[PDB]
Amino acid sequence: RRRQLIRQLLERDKTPLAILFMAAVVGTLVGLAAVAFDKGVAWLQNQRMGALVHTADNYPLLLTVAFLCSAVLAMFGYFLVRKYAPEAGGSGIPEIEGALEDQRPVRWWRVLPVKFFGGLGTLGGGMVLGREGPTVQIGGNIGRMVLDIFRLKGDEARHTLLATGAAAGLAAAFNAPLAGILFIIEEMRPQFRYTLISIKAVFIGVIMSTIMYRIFNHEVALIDVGKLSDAPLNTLWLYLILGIIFGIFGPIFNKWVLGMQDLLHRVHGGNITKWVLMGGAIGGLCGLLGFVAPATSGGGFNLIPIATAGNFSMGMLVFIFVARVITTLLCFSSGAPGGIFAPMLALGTVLGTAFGMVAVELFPQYHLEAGTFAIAGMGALLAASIRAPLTGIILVLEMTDNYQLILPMIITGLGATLLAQFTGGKPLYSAILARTLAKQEAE
Amino acid sequence: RRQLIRQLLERDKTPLAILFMAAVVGTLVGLAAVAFDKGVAWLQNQRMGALVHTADNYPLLLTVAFLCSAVLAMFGYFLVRKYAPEAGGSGIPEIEGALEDQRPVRWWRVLPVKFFGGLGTLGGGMVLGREGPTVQIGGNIGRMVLDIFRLKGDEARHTLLATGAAAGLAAAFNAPLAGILFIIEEMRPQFRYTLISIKAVFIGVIMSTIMYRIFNHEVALIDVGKLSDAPLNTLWLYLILGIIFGIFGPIFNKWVLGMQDLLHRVHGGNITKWVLMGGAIGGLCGLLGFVAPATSGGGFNLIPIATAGNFSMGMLVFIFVARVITTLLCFSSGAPGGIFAPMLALGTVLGTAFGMVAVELFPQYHLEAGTFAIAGMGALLAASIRAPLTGIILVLEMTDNYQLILPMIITGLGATLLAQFTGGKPLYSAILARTLAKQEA
């Protein structure tokens, strides 16, 4: 096979011009789509805010229209999914992951409006879910859409355009282009065999998508954390210890989301009415908690700078962590459309800060800043539960811009993945696609 | 399908034996990289002090400059030709071949040959990079412990050989991310499936970097400061720059390939004609490394100076031309040493050139030429080696100007696109092919 290789080597990186151009098209659309979605969620959270002021005196009445507004919006989200596109519930990343293995269908004519408006409700209602869930699955379907429209033929085009769509979706959700491309080549793409996903083309989509986001969302970062302090060599062992903590909690959190999928499935049994009602109950709880304790509900991007800056007490940190574990599980294991990335960044930050605080008092000779352990533990739950550390690290790096902490971020993130494996944990996205694939045969 | 459902549930369960050994490989590749780095620095230092010993007789001083680097070069070419011919040139294509199981990893030979052979060419101040030695060494270090502990399996052989190459790039630039990204974008078997545990490559890259940090902290290879931001209406200039790199990339690619040929006629394959030609080239660098140091050496020294715009346009053009010459002469001669570093310097200079023109044509954009230098810095890496995602993350890790990520990506991709469309080829893959085809003919 030496003679095949010599031929192959000389023919390396010559992606078909038709694929490159369409990748630029997919990226732009996924970009505009993600911006539109982001503008929609913001508007709804804003109306709900304005409604609570309309009745800002009668506290029991105000606690109600908080609930109902998010309850109604939640129900509308669960319903759009159950009735028109059941595959558009939950994260959406496992579904696009399956579509790359050619084992799941990309029904773009249905999921595009279902996910966009269904997620618009769950997110707009202030449930503990992330934007990447919608944007990635939408992005993947946008990729499939132009494939069918322009009738491009081949596995390369199908696999590529479906990949650049998912990548341009994650990148436009975080303003993180590198994390988007890195997600495709570490987690998304077919993991157990070869594939023809042109990386150069995945880039072009991610660029155009990011450029679209930059045109409509510039000047205001999702997470501003400032330039933190550096990390001395003799302080590194503290980050490994932190990673080991995430490493044994990761798999545990993984079981809970899986098990809570089951327990919540008994409440409705599969019935479209019991489910939608259960959704509004959960959704209504979040919009309520999003007024009496806003750190326990919502995406989580708001309490990240606050936690890093050490403006929370240890009592508040413990409270927020427990309360968010609950509302994260309740929201993601319910089947509502929405990703789990963003609330796992928040969970990781809080826990990291908690470790950072104890680290500060036990070791004043290290001159520690608890905000360094928050950034280190920020993409750690992504590492111990999702088991894609290289993506989670570059994601955090792209959002916090604290490169002088790259070693603690890596050391913690890897201690997470090591202990997640060694304690019998499984990739949450892959352990879901298997649960979905195996039930498609169980029945 | 039921196979997939089985595979999914068994995803990321890298054997603990492979993980532990990866930590060992990285540590060794780390220390080895550190020691190599300390060696090269020492020799460049001695030559410096010897020029002071005779800092009056200008003709005499121009000589002991030549000779010191000339002799050191000769010792380098000889160590390669006599004991490990595969340890000449970059060394990256060689490890790349090893991953395809199409080249042998003779670690018992290459380790001392490359370490000391590179110690001469680099220490002589030739236009070569540290990653050549460190990556190839790192791969063989990885192969070494595989053999020593007698680990069995393709996974172990493929992984340990990869973590070693990654941990060698990482310990050469203090760039852990670019190290891991290099394996999964360029190094690993590109046309079929493989069993390279990414988690294990990480562990090696960490421990290697940690070793580098223990002996080289507080002083960055490239300090450039925090540059200005890049407005949205300024992005088209970066695509234009990438287009320029995109057409020069393939051209430079032909020249390095062609100069390999022409320099092979001078010695014909003879070990003596070669080594003597080596000291001629190597002696030129140590000479040029005194009368115009910007035209010789790795290049990391003129990078901050160029970005800060402390060069004139006249000097910039000179430096670019004079470095195209001394880069080809050094890498196409077969001397041990990587071509990454001198391509970063080539990309920086061309970028600053484009930046300066941009500044005067567009005062309404309020431009800083140092932004185009950082954009163009990993552009030659993109248009010639054709690994843009690694080149971008490499520059990012070394310059720490993340607020320029869009220009860096737009330029880097405008390089790879035009490199393809103008019939260019991956220089590292266009070499492994040249080497594999002379093997079956």
Swiss-Prot record, chain A:
GO terms for cellular component: plasma membrane. The keyword ATP-binding does not apply. A motif (Selectivity filter part_1) lies at residues 90-94. The chain crosses the membrane at residues 17-53, 61-84, 108-125, 132-150, 199-216, 237-265, 272-293, 314-333, 339-360, 406-422. Residues 93-100, 161-173, 177-185, 371-385, 386-388, 389-400, 401-405 dip into the membrane without crossing it. It holds the Pfam family Voltage_CLC. Induction: By acid-shock conditions. Residues 54-60, 217-236, 294-313, 361-370 are periplasmic. It is a multi-pass membrane protein. A motif (Selectivity filter part_3) lies at residues 339-343. Changing S91A: Uncouples chloride transport from proton transport. A motif (Selectivity filter part_2) lies at residues 130-134. The record marks E187 as: Mediates proton transfer from the protein to the inner aqueous phase. GO terms for biological process: cellular stress response to acidic pH; chloride transmembrane transport; proton transmembrane transport. Its main location: membrane. It catalyses: 2 chloride(in) + H(+)(out) = 2 chloride(out) + H(+)(in). Keywords: Antiport, Cell inner membrane, Cell membrane, Chloride, Ion transport, Membrane, Stress response, Transmembrane, Transmembrane helix, Transport. Residues 101-107, 151-160, 186-198, 266-271, 423-443 are cytoplasmic. It is found in: Cell inner membrane. The record marks E132 as: Mediates proton transfer from the outer aqueous phase to the interior of the protein. SUPFAM superfamilies: Clc chloride channel. Belongs to the chloride channel (TC 2.A.49) family. ClcA subfamily. Homodimer. This is H(+)/Cl(-) exchange transporter ClcA. It comes from Escherichia coli (strain K12). The lineage of its organism: Bacteria, Pseudomonadati, Pseudomonadota, Gammaproteobacteria, Enterobacterales. The gene is clcA.
